[PDB]
Design a protein around this ligand. Structure first.
Ligand SMILES: O=C(O)c1cc(I)c(-n2cccc2)c(I)c1O
Ligand SMILES: [Zn+2]
Length: 195
Protein backbone atom coordinates (compact mmCIF):
# COMPACT_ATOMS: atom_id res chain seq x y z
CA UNK A 1 0.00 0.00 0.00
CA UNK A 2 2.86 2.35 0.88
CA UNK A 3 6.56 2.24 -0.14
CA UNK A 4 9.11 2.42 2.69
CA UNK A 5 10.99 5.70 3.12
CA UNK A 6 13.50 4.35 5.65
CA UNK A 7 17.03 5.58 5.01
CA UNK A 8 19.23 2.53 4.37
CA UNK A 9 22.84 2.80 3.27
CA UNK A 10 23.17 -0.96 2.84
CA UNK A 11 26.31 -2.90 1.97
CA UNK A 12 27.62 -0.35 -0.51
CA UNK A 13 27.20 2.73 1.68
CA UNK A 14 24.60 4.29 -0.63
CA UNK A 15 23.47 7.88 -0.13
CA UNK A 16 22.45 10.99 -2.06
CA UNK A 17 24.22 14.30 -2.48
CA UNK A 18 23.10 17.72 -3.65
CA UNK A 19 24.81 20.76 -5.13
CA UNK A 20 24.98 24.11 -3.37
CA UNK A 21 22.97 26.36 -5.64
CA UNK A 22 22.01 29.14 -3.23
CA UNK A 23 18.70 30.97 -2.92
CA UNK A 24 18.86 33.82 -5.44
CA UNK A 25 15.44 34.56 -6.96
CA UNK A 26 16.82 33.35 -10.31
CA UNK A 27 17.81 29.87 -9.09
CA UNK A 28 15.94 26.98 -10.75
CA UNK A 29 16.77 24.14 -8.36
CA UNK A 30 18.04 24.39 -4.80
CA UNK A 31 18.38 21.93 -1.93
CA UNK A 32 17.84 22.65 1.77
CA UNK A 33 19.84 20.37 4.07
CA UNK A 34 18.02 21.75 7.13
CA UNK A 35 14.66 20.74 5.64
CA UNK A 36 15.94 17.78 3.57
CA UNK A 37 13.91 19.39 0.83
CA UNK A 38 14.53 20.09 -2.84
CA UNK A 39 12.89 23.18 -4.34
CA UNK A 40 12.68 23.32 -8.12
CA UNK A 41 10.93 24.92 -11.06
CA UNK A 42 8.64 23.00 -13.40
CA UNK A 43 10.47 20.68 -15.83
CA UNK A 44 13.90 22.07 -14.93
CA UNK A 45 17.05 20.00 -14.43
CA UNK A 46 17.47 18.66 -10.90
CA UNK A 47 20.96 17.21 -10.41
CA UNK A 48 21.03 14.48 -7.78
CA UNK A 49 24.34 12.88 -6.81
CA UNK A 50 24.72 9.19 -6.01
CA UNK A 51 27.52 8.27 -3.57
CA UNK A 52 28.77 4.85 -2.48
CA UNK A 53 31.62 3.50 -0.34
CA UNK A 54 32.13 0.49 -2.60
CA UNK A 55 31.17 -0.48 -6.14
CA UNK A 56 27.86 -2.32 -6.55
CA UNK A 57 27.64 -5.31 -8.94
CA UNK A 58 27.02 -4.97 -12.69
CA UNK A 59 23.27 -4.80 -13.26
CA UNK A 60 22.56 -2.65 -10.21
CA UNK A 61 19.94 0.05 -10.90
CA UNK A 62 18.67 3.29 -9.34
CA UNK A 63 14.91 3.94 -9.09
CA UNK A 64 13.00 7.14 -8.28
CA UNK A 65 9.41 7.21 -7.02
CA UNK A 66 7.23 9.94 -5.50
CA UNK A 67 4.83 9.48 -2.59
CA UNK A 68 2.69 11.93 -0.63
CA UNK A 69 4.36 12.93 2.62
CA UNK A 70 1.21 13.24 4.75
CA UNK A 71 -0.02 9.93 6.14
CA UNK A 72 -3.66 10.51 5.17
CA UNK A 73 -2.59 10.77 1.51
CA UNK A 74 0.21 8.24 1.33
CA UNK A 75 -1.86 5.49 -0.29
CA UNK A 76 -2.75 7.82 -3.19
CA UNK A 77 -0.63 7.44 -6.32
CA UNK A 78 1.34 10.61 -7.11
CA UNK A 79 0.63 11.50 -10.74
CA UNK A 80 0.51 14.49 -13.06
CA UNK A 81 -2.61 16.64 -12.93
CA UNK A 82 -5.45 16.51 -15.47
CA UNK A 83 -3.92 19.43 -17.38
CA UNK A 84 -0.28 18.36 -17.55
CA UNK A 85 -0.95 14.71 -18.38
CA UNK A 86 -2.62 16.05 -21.56
CA UNK A 87 -0.20 18.78 -22.66
CA UNK A 88 1.76 16.47 -25.01
CA UNK A 89 5.19 17.44 -23.67
CA UNK A 90 6.39 13.86 -24.12
CA UNK A 91 10.11 13.21 -24.53
CA UNK A 92 9.29 10.00 -26.39
CA UNK A 93 10.02 7.76 -23.41
CA UNK A 94 8.24 9.03 -20.28
CA UNK A 95 4.52 8.24 -20.13
CA UNK A 96 2.59 11.52 -19.97
CA UNK A 97 1.16 10.62 -16.54
CA UNK A 98 4.56 10.32 -14.79
CA UNK A 99 5.63 13.15 -12.49
CA UNK A 100 9.32 12.24 -12.42
CA UNK A 101 11.44 11.96 -15.55
CA UNK A 102 15.10 11.23 -16.06
CA UNK A 103 16.72 13.66 -18.46
CA UNK A 104 19.26 12.62 -21.10
CA UNK A 105 19.46 8.88 -20.47
CA UNK A 106 18.23 6.63 -23.26
CA UNK A 107 18.38 3.63 -20.91
CA UNK A 108 15.80 5.05 -18.53
CA UNK A 109 12.81 2.76 -18.03
CA UNK A 110 9.40 3.84 -16.79
CA UNK A 111 7.28 1.51 -14.70
CA UNK A 112 3.55 1.47 -14.08
CA UNK A 113 3.36 -1.06 -11.24
CA UNK A 114 0.81 -3.75 -12.13
CA UNK A 115 -0.26 -4.15 -8.49
CA UNK A 116 0.14 -0.74 -6.84
CA UNK A 117 -0.28 1.42 -9.96
CA UNK A 118 2.56 3.61 -8.75
CA UNK A 119 4.94 5.24 -11.20
CA UNK A 120 8.69 5.08 -11.13
CA UNK A 121 11.70 5.65 -13.34
CA UNK A 122 14.79 3.48 -13.17
CA UNK A 123 18.25 3.70 -14.74
CA UNK A 124 21.30 1.43 -14.77
CA UNK A 125 24.15 2.29 -12.44
CA UNK A 126 27.14 3.68 -14.29
CA UNK A 127 30.54 4.53 -12.75
CA UNK A 128 31.59 8.18 -12.38
CA UNK A 129 33.36 9.81 -15.32
CA UNK A 130 37.15 9.86 -15.00
CA UNK A 131 38.00 12.69 -12.61
CA UNK A 132 34.69 12.48 -10.73
CA UNK A 133 33.93 10.80 -7.42
CA UNK A 134 30.17 10.40 -7.79
CA UNK A 135 27.52 9.80 -10.45
CA UNK A 136 24.82 12.39 -11.12
CA UNK A 137 21.30 11.71 -12.34
CA UNK A 138 19.29 14.59 -13.83
CA UNK A 139 15.62 14.50 -12.84
CA UNK A 140 12.70 16.66 -13.92
CA UNK A 141 9.44 17.18 -12.07
CA UNK A 142 6.59 17.68 -14.50
CA UNK A 143 3.86 19.28 -12.33
CA UNK A 144 3.75 22.07 -9.78
CA UNK A 145 3.09 21.13 -6.16
CA UNK A 146 0.07 23.42 -6.47
CA UNK A 147 -1.48 21.77 -9.55
CA UNK A 148 -5.24 21.42 -9.15
CA UNK A 149 -6.53 17.87 -9.41
CA UNK A 150 -2.97 16.58 -9.04
CA UNK A 151 -0.65 17.18 -6.09
CA UNK A 152 -2.98 20.06 -5.12
CA UNK A 153 -0.57 21.70 -2.64
CA UNK A 154 0.20 18.40 -0.89
CA UNK A 155 3.90 17.86 -0.09
CA UNK A 156 5.63 14.88 -1.68
CA UNK A 157 8.76 12.87 -1.02
CA UNK A 158 11.04 11.38 -3.65
CA UNK A 159 12.37 7.96 -2.68
CA UNK A 160 15.60 6.86 -4.37
CA UNK A 161 16.36 3.17 -4.20
CA UNK A 162 19.45 1.23 -5.18
CA UNK A 163 18.28 -2.17 -6.52
CA UNK A 164 19.88 -5.36 -7.76
CA UNK A 165 19.03 -6.78 -11.20
CA UNK A 166 15.91 -8.50 -9.77
CA UNK A 167 14.67 -5.32 -8.11
CA UNK A 168 15.67 -6.33 -4.59
CA UNK A 169 16.55 -3.52 -2.19
CA UNK A 170 20.24 -2.61 -1.77
CA UNK A 171 19.98 0.95 -0.48
CA UNK A 172 17.45 3.76 0.07
CA UNK A 173 17.47 7.53 0.56
CA UNK A 174 14.79 10.22 0.24
CA UNK A 175 14.03 13.92 0.19
CA UNK A 176 10.97 16.17 0.22
CA UNK A 177 10.22 18.09 -3.00
CA UNK A 178 8.39 21.34 -3.72
CA UNK A 179 7.89 22.21 -7.37
CA UNK A 180 7.27 25.94 -7.52
CA UNK A 181 7.79 29.15 -9.48
CA UNK A 182 10.42 30.63 -7.15
CA UNK A 183 12.49 27.93 -5.43
CA UNK A 184 15.00 30.43 -3.99
CA UNK A 185 12.38 32.53 -2.23
CA UNK A 186 10.43 29.51 -1.03
CA UNK A 187 13.55 27.85 0.39
CA UNK A 188 14.42 31.06 2.24
CA UNK A 189 10.86 31.33 3.56
CA UNK A 190 10.62 27.73 4.77
CA UNK A 191 14.07 27.81 6.38
CA UNK A 192 13.03 30.97 8.22
CA UNK A 193 9.82 29.29 9.39
CA UNK A 194 11.90 26.41 10.72
CA UNK A 195 14.26 28.73 12.60
O1 LIG B 1 33.40 4.45 -7.80
C1 LIG B 1 32.75 3.52 -8.38
O2 LIG B 1 33.21 2.43 -8.83
C2 LIG B 1 31.27 3.71 -8.54
C3 LIG B 1 30.54 2.76 -9.28
C4 LIG B 1 29.15 2.87 -9.46
I1 LIG B 1 28.30 1.31 -10.64
C5 LIG B 1 28.48 3.97 -8.88
N1 LIG B 1 27.09 4.20 -8.97
C6 LIG B 1 26.19 3.92 -7.95
C7 LIG B 1 24.93 4.30 -8.34
C8 LIG B 1 25.05 4.83 -9.65
C9 LIG B 1 26.38 4.76 -10.01
C10 LIG B 1 29.21 4.92 -8.13
I2 LIG B 1 28.29 6.62 -7.23
C11 LIG B 1 30.60 4.79 -7.96
O3 LIG B 1 31.33 5.70 -7.24
ZN1 LIG C 1 0.17 19.87 -13.34
Amino acid sequence: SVPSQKTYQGSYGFRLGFLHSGTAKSVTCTYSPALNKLFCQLAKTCPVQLWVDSTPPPGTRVRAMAIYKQSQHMTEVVRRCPHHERCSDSDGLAPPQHLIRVEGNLRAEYLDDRNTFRHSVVVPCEPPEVGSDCTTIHYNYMCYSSCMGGMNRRPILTIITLEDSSGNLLGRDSFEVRVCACPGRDRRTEEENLR
